[PDB]
Design a protein around this ligand. Sequence first.
Ligand SMILES: *P(=O)(O)OCC(C)(C)[C@@H](O)C(N)=O
Lengths: 66, 1005, 242, 96, 72, 48, 145
Amino acid sequence: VELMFIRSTNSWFDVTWRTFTGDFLRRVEERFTKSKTLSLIQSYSLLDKPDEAIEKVFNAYPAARE
Amino acid sequence: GVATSFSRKKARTFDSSWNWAKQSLLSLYFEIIHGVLKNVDREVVSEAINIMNRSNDALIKFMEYHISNTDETKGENYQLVKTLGEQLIENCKQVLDVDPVYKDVAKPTGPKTAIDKNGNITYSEEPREKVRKLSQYVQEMALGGPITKESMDVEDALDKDSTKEVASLPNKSTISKTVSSTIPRETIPFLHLRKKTPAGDWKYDRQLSSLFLDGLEKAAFNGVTFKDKYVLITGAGKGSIGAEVLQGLLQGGAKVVVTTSRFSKQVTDYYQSIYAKYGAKGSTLIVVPFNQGSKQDVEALIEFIYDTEKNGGLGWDLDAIIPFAAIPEQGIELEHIDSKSEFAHRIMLTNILRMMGCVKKQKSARGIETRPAQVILPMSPNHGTFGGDGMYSESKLSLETLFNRWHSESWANQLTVCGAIIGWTRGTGLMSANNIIAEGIEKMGVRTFSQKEMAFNLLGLLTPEVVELCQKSPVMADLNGGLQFVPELKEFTAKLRKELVETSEVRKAVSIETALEHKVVNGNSADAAYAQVEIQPRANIQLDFPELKPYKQVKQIAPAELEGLLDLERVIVVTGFAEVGPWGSARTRWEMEAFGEFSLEGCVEMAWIMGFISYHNGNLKGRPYTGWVDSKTKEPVDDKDVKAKYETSILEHSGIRLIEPELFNGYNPEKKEMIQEVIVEEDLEPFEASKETAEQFKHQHGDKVDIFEIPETGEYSVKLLKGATLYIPKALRFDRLVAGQIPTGWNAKTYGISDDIISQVDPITLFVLVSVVEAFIASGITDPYEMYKYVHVSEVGNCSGSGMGGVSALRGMFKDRFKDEPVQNDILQESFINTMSAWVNMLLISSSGPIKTPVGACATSVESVDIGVETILSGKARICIVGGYDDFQEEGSFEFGNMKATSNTLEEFEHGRTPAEMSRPATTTRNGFMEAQGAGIQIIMQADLALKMGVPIYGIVAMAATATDKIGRSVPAPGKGILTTAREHHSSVKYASPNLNMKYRKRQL
Amino acid sequence: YNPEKKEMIQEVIVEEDLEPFEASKETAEQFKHQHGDKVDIFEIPETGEYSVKLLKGATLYIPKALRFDRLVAGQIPTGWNAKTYGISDDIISQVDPITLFVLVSVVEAFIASGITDPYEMYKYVHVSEVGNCSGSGMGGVSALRGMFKDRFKDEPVQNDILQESFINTMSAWVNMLLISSSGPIKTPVGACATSVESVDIGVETILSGKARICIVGGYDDFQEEGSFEFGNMKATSNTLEE
Amino acid sequence: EQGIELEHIDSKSEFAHRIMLTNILRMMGCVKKQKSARGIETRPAQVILPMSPNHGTFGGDGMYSESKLSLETLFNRWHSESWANQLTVCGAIIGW
Amino acid sequence: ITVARKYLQTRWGLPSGRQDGVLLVALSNEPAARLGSEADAKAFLDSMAQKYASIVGVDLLEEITKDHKVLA
Amino acid sequence: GTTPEKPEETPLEELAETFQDTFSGALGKQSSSLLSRLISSKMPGGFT
Amino acid sequence: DKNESATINEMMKHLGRSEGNPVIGVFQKFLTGHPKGAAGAWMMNGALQILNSGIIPGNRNADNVDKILEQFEYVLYPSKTLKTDGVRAVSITSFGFGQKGGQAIVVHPDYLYGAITEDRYNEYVAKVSAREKSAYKFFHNGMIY
Ligand SMILES: *P(=O)(O)OCC(C)(C)[C@@H](O)C(N)=O
């Protein structure tokens, strides 16, 4: 988020880069879930406020913080 | 069909209720403390009954300690268990020296059929209105209904406080007005006994039927005993009226024989678990394999029951037979009656008659004329009323002749017939084709039954009133719940079934079409921003380091005086550990030991160990792939798909199992290669050897060989003369076919040991090298040399050892040399027990610290630990590897067989044991040990060092000891010399030692 | 064992069928099981004994003899006999030769300590405070011949031969026939250092306060097969060069 | 079968049970198959079953009564299966 | 080794200087177990005769009178 | 085949009589296996 | 399995174990078989796993416990896994060929940390939490490669 998402314009520089960080957050959920669940990041639209969408994933999989 | 299944040697007795009472009470205790069972659950009552039913002095001493040493301050669930407990102790004492009881206390369910919006048919058994107890169920059964018309409230605490319903379990409730007087005149109950009228029909008798229902009312309040009742029961497999009867019998301390068609480990375990939850004090359960379609098994079975324990029988004398075995025949109309129906007709009738015939012969034999056997015949009310049952109805209706034959033959003092007309019984609580319509029949004003209710009804025909009645005249019990009075039942049933299939099928099609209309009118923007994303889990394999609690919680555990009191240079502490053995690692073995099944992470490690899957990072057929991949087909495998793809294969090729020859250099215990010396009675046909090799034959044989240069080649001819010795191979068939082997595909390569090493070192060294690495990883020590930041090179020791060592290298230097096979020249150095430790030092540690290798046969690991500790306290080593390691080969397998130490596998198979259930410690039937292979390793340190390095600390090695026994002439006989660890003096034991009190000891410091 | 005539066996293929010989029923089925097609076995109907025809393509083992270059060893003097110390034949004909050297060494060591009756120790010290911390580099090596070579040749070998092989049994027999301690037993394997390791294990057992007394030492036998294997490592002096 | 009480039911009674019941059913089964084969649906065969009035009332008949009483299921099965247009049952309770 | 030298002289036409070199490539590339048939022993030496070829750079009626004399 | 309840405390005089009552005269399994192995191992070439 | 039960029962009798407080047996060889020299190392691994979980695994092949073993009041022989509120200590007993008994007591590691200061403990905790991450890094790297 620090390197691909731009605070001034409050948007991702490139949408292929948003895709990149979404694909990564999906892999956190795959790695840290015990059981087949529905994803917390359904649409990559949700990433457009990206600190809220990071907390959402690392609340539900707090092992990933550590 | 007619093949013999029964052997006496396959009979499994379960009788150890004294042990299963204590296990059941502890299992309830922790279930209540971990809030799995609450004070509202009925299972805490059900479970209480089964602990009362096994009440003895030992079990009260046990419950007193476990319940009078719970700190109720520690949480709300610790208050619950102490309140419940105190009660359960007060009950158990009241009922000590009182016969145990079948008392079912489960919530009686009804059937419920639901069809959703999309036309999916759901079946769910559903708590009834006004029937929330079995007391109530007997009232409901007595009143009958509007269609059965021929032309009382004891408050409890179920489902609010079960600790109060526990208090009321011994209190034997007496009632004035019995439920005989509830039965409204001009109405037939749902459960009723019949009476034969002189015309020769059977009619509802009101007065017989009262007696039955009054016994059933009391069974429900007070409960029934079956103490001293001996029972044969057939077709009592899992999910049957058979099996809910079996529970009830055992629950009243019956002694039951139970026959299974399909005898297996999976079944012998089902039965172990029923007996260990239900078998009350004095109960016993014998499980025999059995074919009721075999004449010769029926003859055998009753001979085994009646025969003396001395001639290998039981010594019993049956007080009830319950022959409920059946094969299901469906879609067999009268044009299709063939071998299956002819064979079924033998199970369900002629061999029933032959089994009652048999008990009459064995009872007469011994002049037993006053101890008859109640035969409970499973009758149908419906003979040919459905069809497509094959010879089922012809089978059932012919059992109705036994009611007459009892008066007309010579067997009434051995047998008593008690025909149960068993009605509509809802198979399981899932979707049986019959279940979905149960709800529909019930609307007629009729009753269907759970199997627990139909069990209850039939256990009422074993109460001492209807037993006393059976012994006068035969007893016809009608446990059909008014289905006689629904008219044209076949068409009525088939209406109901039509109208659910229609209503579902229609509503499934009208659903699918209204979701293709919508999809055409509104496209794939209304049905695509809707279909959600799912997340299949991957396998995060964890090291399972221990949970460190916040310091404030840690001071609560230990006494306050302990701070500053111990010298931690002189506390020893296990810092990591690992193993290679039949279930892989310490990680995977724990998942099998504790849980019996593998996790997603266990399947992946096992799959990885056995080389079923391999990692891939690059291009798979053009595509870029990063994941696991089938090691053979290189095809991509997901973690969720590992269990499906590979579990079966992992469980077949792990554990105790048949010896796999490819693992032991083609050792096939069925074909064990020896050589017999014979004398050449007549000269052999010459063969060519080198010069060297011929002189070697001449040197050995002398006169008895002739060797002659062939002058062209230079090669020599070798004529073995009459009187020369030869060795001709033969093959013993050996009776030890099973061993605990490392899982098939285990390979030191997958850990990353080089072929230089593999093709040099003995197999046992590879188990050790992997165990030492995987033990430093458990201690968070990825680079051994990191130790030498904290500790001098001379302060890491190895105090591990083997019982026999490099046993494959002894084959090399005794057998293979003798056969002039190629054997490495340094084979002798690999044999030595002190070399596995050499290779660990030479390839990992590079310590110049102690090496003290023990030999302790089967105790070498605990000796290792002892040598290890005393090396650390001596101040010779700060760190020490400690463990043991041993390989299974052909020759030790054999030598343990000659000592009769190991289980003979052919005896094991006579008893119908699979290789899994062949190691059974503490068991009645245990008959020798199961040879296995592998290594264990622990790392031990000073606690001082462990806290400085910040390595995990898995435990404290408080004590470790070794002891010889006494004068004897038997090296393999175990003894009691280890008792000397409890040696203390008790002459002067009136006042306390102040040295034991830690407070004193701290004041002195 | 004559190192000038060291007995091996070479596998050869029967190029032409052997002259039949008589075996028992049992022994003939054992030949048939091993050889399959390549043997024929037929009941002789008078005797009950079977004929055994080894066919072309059957395997045989023909003995040969290596001449070996290690002819010399430091052996116990000729005529040494556990009988002369007063060990019973029950024991001699049961236990491995190396155990006899140990039993004599433990008696003759208590005599050096003026301890003629081992049990005298238990006037001073508890039963649990006498240890044995002695050990061997290889152990009952004659019993390994029994369980690898002699079994293979279907020679008669005692059924308990495996218990005599173990390095921890010489100490078992010392406890079983003399000491009757219930004190430590910590048997080392140290190859050629097992005695000094023994002493170390011994000392640290006494200072730990586990044992007040400890037997400590080492013991090892010379047999055909170790002689040979040390020759292949080129550890031992070649006697023909010498 | 005479003097065959329930302790003495053996091969003779098991074989008799096949003559007097299972193979009766197999013979009516057979005529249904041969009649259906040829689409004969209007020319049924009256089966006259020899019934007893006395099932177990004398004894020592072996499996005789178990044989006879099981023919009384054909009266129900005629309404419940697919063979009523080929066969018609006419059970005769033949007396002394 | 008489028949193994005599097979390399008839099949391939190698004399007793090259037959040595074919048996030295058959020693470095030794089989794991006993070759079962005479056809496997030939298939083997045919492979090792074409592997000698690679290293050095070499590119390629009266058995009835015998069977009587055996009998005699 | 026969084995009394406690042979290990019963003298070989009294065992010999308990077997002889049920003993035909034939050599059985165990002693026909040991005469075969005496002759196989301890008699010369030809001598069966 | 009688000789072992008997010695455990006589240690526990002589040290005034509370009547009604039997030690729970575990018989891990039901699952693994007997690897003679390795036997006690697997028993020890198993015991540290029991210690740090308070899960006592059951002899799943204990069909029927020998009537001879009910005389041993101070031992329980469970056939199922018992998940407890905690285990403080575990005995490990190994009997060998050649008169070769052994015992080890393993005490739960939370008893160590009562002997040290809050500063020292908090320092150690940090140091280990770091190690465990590093070790995981290493484990998964070495596993796939
Ligand atoms: P003895 O009374 O020494 O018993 C020896 C056997 C083989 C029975 C024993 O060591 C065992 N394995 O239980």
